[PDB]
Amino acid sequence: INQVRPKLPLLKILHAAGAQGEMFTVKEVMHYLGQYIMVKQLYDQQEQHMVYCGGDLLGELLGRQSFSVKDPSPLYDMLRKNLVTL
Ligand SMILES: COc1nc(N(C)C)ncc1-n1nc2c(c1C(C)C)[C@H](c1ccc(C#N)cc1)N(c1cc(Cl)c[nH]c1=O)C2=O
Numbered sequence: 001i002n003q004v005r006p007k008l009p010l011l012k013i014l015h016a017a018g019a020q021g022e023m024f025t026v027k028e029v030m031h032y033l034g035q036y037i038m039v040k041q042l043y044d045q046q047e048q049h050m051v052y053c054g055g056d057l058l059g060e061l062l063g064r065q066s067f068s069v070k071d072p073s074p075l076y077d078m079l080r081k082n083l084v085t086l
């Protein structure tokens with residue numbers, strides 16, 4: 001409904017950040033993605049809107065070495081491709 005099912009590569013990352021199950025809201029997905037970024041401290045301390053995720057699961061998932069949380073077409077492309085609806 002507003003429930004989505006992450007595809008495997010995304011789901012792995014979600015469970016890594018603590019998520020249980022295979023069905024989520026977009027908010028839930030965002031929460032756990034963000035939690036993942038925060039607990040793995042993938043961001044640059046000196047430029048905190050910049051996520052450096054090369055050589056990480058998330059890097060592979062996004063197909064990027066780095067990205068700006070301010071400019072998340074990388075993120076939304078991944079979600080378009082990794083969230084299965086209805
Ligand atoms: C490294 O980033 C940060 N660093 C800090 N420090 C003080 C160090 N504080 C906040 C953030 N931060 N900014 C934003 C977000 C965060 C946390 C939750 C990672 C979330 C977000 C962004 C990207 C993904 C992915 N993959 C998942 C959630 N987010 C969002 C971005 C969009 Cl486009 C939609 N919804 C959001 O919640 C932001 O803008």
Ligand SMILES: [Cl-]
Binds near residue numbers: 018
């Ligand atoms: Cl939690």
